[PDB]
Amino acid sequence: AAMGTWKFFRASVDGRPVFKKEFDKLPDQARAALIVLMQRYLVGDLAAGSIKPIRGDILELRWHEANNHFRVLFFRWGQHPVALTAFYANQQKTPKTKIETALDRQKIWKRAFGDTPPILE
Amino acid sequence: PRRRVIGQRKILPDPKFGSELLAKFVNILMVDGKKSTAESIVYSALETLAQRSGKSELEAFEVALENVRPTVEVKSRRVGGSTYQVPVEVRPVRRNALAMRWIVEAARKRGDKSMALRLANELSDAAENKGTAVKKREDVHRMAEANKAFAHY
Amino acid sequence: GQKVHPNGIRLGIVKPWNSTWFANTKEFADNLDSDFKVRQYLTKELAKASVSRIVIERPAKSIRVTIHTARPGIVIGKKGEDVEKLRKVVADIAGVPAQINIAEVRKPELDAKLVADSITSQLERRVMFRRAMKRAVQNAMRLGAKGIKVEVSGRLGGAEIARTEWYREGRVPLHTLRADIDYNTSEAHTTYGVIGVKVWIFKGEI
RNA sequence: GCUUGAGUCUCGUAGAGGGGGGUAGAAUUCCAGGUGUAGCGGUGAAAUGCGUAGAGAUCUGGAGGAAUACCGGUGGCGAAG
RNA sequence: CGGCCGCAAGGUUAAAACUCAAAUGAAUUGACGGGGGCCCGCACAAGCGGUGGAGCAUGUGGUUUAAUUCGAUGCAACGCGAAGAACCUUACCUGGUCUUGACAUCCACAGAACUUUCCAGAGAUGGAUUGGUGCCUUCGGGAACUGUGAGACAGGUGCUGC
RNA sequence: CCAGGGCUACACACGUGCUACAAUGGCGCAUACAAAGAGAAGCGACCUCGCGAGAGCAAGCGGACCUCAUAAAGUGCGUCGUAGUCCGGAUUGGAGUCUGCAACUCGACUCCAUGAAGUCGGAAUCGCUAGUAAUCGUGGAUCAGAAUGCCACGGUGAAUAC
RNA sequence: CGCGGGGUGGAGCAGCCUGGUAGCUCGUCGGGCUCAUAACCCGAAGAUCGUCGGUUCAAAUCCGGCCCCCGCAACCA
RNA sequence: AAUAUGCCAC
Ligand SMILES: [Mg+2]
Ligand SMILES: [Mg+2]
Ligand SMILES: [Mg+2]
Ligand SMILES: [Mg+2]
Ligand SMILES: [Mg+2]
Ligand SMILES: [Mg+2]
Ligand SMILES: [Mg+2]
Ligand SMILES: [Mg+2]
Ligand SMILES: [Mg+2]
Ligand SMILES: [Mg+2]
Ligand SMILES: [Mg+2]
Ligand SMILES: [Mg+2]
Ligand SMILES: [Mg+2]
């Protein structure tokens, strides 16, 4: 809501951000573009065909390469969504492998920073 | 298979007695292709049982087998919701194979020392209907008797 | 599915070896590298002459290279001034005395390597690939090959989706080992990428 | 004017064509009783349900309602239902 | 909606605004069926022996780290590329260094190469230098091998197997 | 380009294997029977030394000749007598051999010692119908060293299929 | 305000009335079947009982208050 | 006897 109510995935309290590194790995200005799209997720307009609840509560945010494939698996943790993994994929539909990695990161975040987010945040 | 098997593989009768029935017994008892060990164990069991009883080794073996051999077993048929335990009469070759297999299972599961001792004791118990093998035959026949209603098939 | 090499699966049966020198484990690697260098140099320097086949033998500390070519006059030149230079460089590469022997290839229209090279040159020259393939098949079946198959695969005609098209006439029984299937490949480096040409020519039996 | 359309009369024909009235046998159900015991009934299995207060089964006698086995037939009749 | 009919359920007559570029019928080729018929395969059934439990080896995912290089990841990835990571390999990381370059051609100049030895530096690399100063020869120059000097380029296990 | 490090990290999860859980066995002593392959800065006899890995001198052989290289399971005798055990070998301590400039991260092997979990494995799941499965050893490629993997070779050798 | 109750894993409930110890279902986690998910199958963990202070050798239990949540009552003029 | 589902341009 304050244009930055995002939380990036860490494996623990001081666990080196396992998403910021996998995000810096993303080639070139796709990083800035995806930051823009996160801002747009907090804007409330981010266009059609870009977001998809893949399976579970895991939402794929998409960008480019072939057809919207600079993919980012996140999930909504209250008002502030948590960005799990960010990855390049070629074929449509995030590989099952990457999906299952996203699910496991979701569960790990739940068991680290909490199951439901704080009362007021 | 969906075609048909040729004639059964030829089996060389065992040297000490020349009985293909005993050859099959040795083969069934054999583990990891150690026929020498299987034959030694079977021969020791046979001589031991012959000495404890008095019968010839071959005829005593036949008596122990006969007290364990079934006549009707149960096979599974599908109609719906539940399965039919249809009782089917057994052919003699399968009778002997099953008797040998049950004897060997009981002997292996017995708690003695040398397997020759285990086999001699198990066959001796079969000679008066006491072993786990004759217990298994009892179970097979009483299960078939219970399911006898399905026999008509 | 993938298919076995029509030459390799027949080498010991109805084909010859393009190299018949004997050496032991001390010499095998060096002789193979030198044969590779000689063949590469010869093909590069005789791209124009249409060299159909290069056989190499090593009798005794010597190298004999038989060049089955379709323009022996072209590869020889005046008297022998061209083959002399070729022999000199071949000897220098192989580190041993050389002997180049030119072999007449009658009918470049029944030789898989020459057909493939012709088709690739046309493809570079931007001729229609369907026309090139039909021309090759017609030429071979008029020269009298019992059968021929031509396959061209790649970004044909500037397409962005690579496809494969193949023409055929007569019989090309690749499964029969005794059948004379002369097969060979070539590549055409067009401005839109590489295009692969494969030619099978069935010339007869035993 | 005419009769070949249309219609009437004379003789017969086949039909679950319609409306009204009566009756027949088979069967299910119920009621009364007799014999007669622990099961019955049901399902793919099961349970709900019925039964030792005596069911189910079987026999006798009633009551009442509904529908008409066989004939029975891409058979018949009817404008259709 | 309004008339008419109805006791009501509702029937009958009967639009419009908007919205799409189709909806539809019959046949055709496949595919599919918890449709049928006829078959086959260690597919089941009949047997034997395993895995899943234990310790270890190995690969993978995940965490971790500066790096834990990259690839394969339904069957048809996971003792797979890799027929064999101490340095090398090695592509990754931390630092020390070089930029016509380690490797190619071509331009010019210098110098035979080659061998040995001393210093410093983790080594790269830089200082030197003992010996060497030739092989053909239009004997003057070229052939080699080395350094230097600008490049035209070289280099890329960087991306894209859609 | 160079030296160090990493690819060998470990709360975990999965795949594929190896060794086991024992008496159809373990250990000790004697002994029989193979196929196929490799080899020249390579295979390395014999002999001497070492408890062993191995070391010294060193023939022979690019080989139907020599070496690798005594096959093991099997057979004969003894022992153990059902016990977490003379099963089982993980882990760890000390001492060492070889390769390689170099074995700390991170090698293999040997000796002494330690001797773990494991008593046949839930749901589930795999291979196999013949000399196959099962079981026992041998060789090779890669390779300085570094196989339980991979690729081959033989020995013993079944049950079952209505 | 008086009176009767209640506070128990992440949710719903037992247990407590007879002080010697906390269970059920759903859920969660791990594996399995599935191309994948749901259902399903097999294993596991999880609350130290609202809270303070007493009693007692021992308190979820007994007691006294305190906090919050329900229910009844808060009338006659 | 039970046997629900499958949204990522092509
Ligand atoms: Mg693809
Ligand atoms: Mg109306
Ligand atoms: Mg089976
Ligand atoms: Mg496990
Ligand atoms: Mg296991
Ligand atoms: Mg990796
Ligand atoms: Mg390294
Ligand atoms: Mg492809
Ligand atoms: Mg690795
Ligand atoms: Mg031991
Ligand atoms: Mg070797
Ligand atoms: Mg090796
Ligand atoms: Mg074998």
From Swiss-Prot, chain A:
Signal peptide: none annotated. Pfam families: Gp49. Disruption phenotype: A triple higB1-higA1-Rv1957 disruption mutant has no visible phenotype. It is an enzyme of class 3 (hydrolase). It comes from the Bacteria. Keywords: Endonuclease, Hydrolase, Nuclease, Toxin-antitoxin system. GO terms for molecular function: RNA endonuclease activity. GO terms for biological process: detoxification; negative regulation of growth; response to hypoxia. Its EC number is 3.1.-.-. The keyword Amino-acid biosynthesis does not apply. The keyword Glycosyltransferase does not apply. Induction: Induced by hypoxia and by DNA damaging agent mitomycin C. Part of the Rv1954A-higB1-higA1-Rv1957 operon, as well as the higB1-higA1-Rv1957 operon, which is probably the mitomycin-induced operon; the former but not latter operon is autorepressed by HigA1. Induced in persister cells in response to D-cycloserine. Toxic component of an atypical, type II toxin-antitoxin chaperone (TAC) system. Upon expression in M.smegmatis inhibits colony formation and cell growth. Ectopic expression in wild-type M.tuberculosis has no effect on cell growth; ectopic expression in a triple higB1-higA1-Rv1957 (delta TAC) disruption mutant causes growth arrest, killing a considerable proportion of the cells. Belongs to the mycobacterial HigB family. This is Probable endoribonuclease HigB1. It comes from Mycobacterium tuberculosis (strain ATCC 25618 / H37Rv).
From Swiss-Prot, chain C:
GO terms for molecular function: mRNA binding; rRNA binding; structural constituent of ribosome. The keyword S-adenosyl-L-methionine does not apply. Gene3D superfamilies: 3.30.300.20, Ribosomal protein S3, C-terminal domain. Keywords: Ribonucleoprotein, Ribosomal protein, RNA-binding, rRNA-binding. Pfam families: KH_2 (PF07650), Ribosomal_S3_C (PF00189). Belongs to the universal ribosomal protein uS3 family. Binds the lower part of the 30S subunit head. Binds mRNA in the 70S ribosome, positioning it for translation. Plays a role in mRNA unwinding by the ribosome, possibly by forming part of a processivity clamp. Part of the 30S ribosomal subunit. Forms a tight complex with proteins uS10 and uS14. With proteins uS4 and uS5 encircles the mRNA as it enters the ribosome, which may play a role in mRNA helicase processivity. Some nascent polypeptide chains are able to cross-link to this protein in situ. In collided ribosomes contacts ribosome rescue factor SmrB. This is Small ribosomal subunit protein uS3. It comes from Escherichia coli (strain K12).
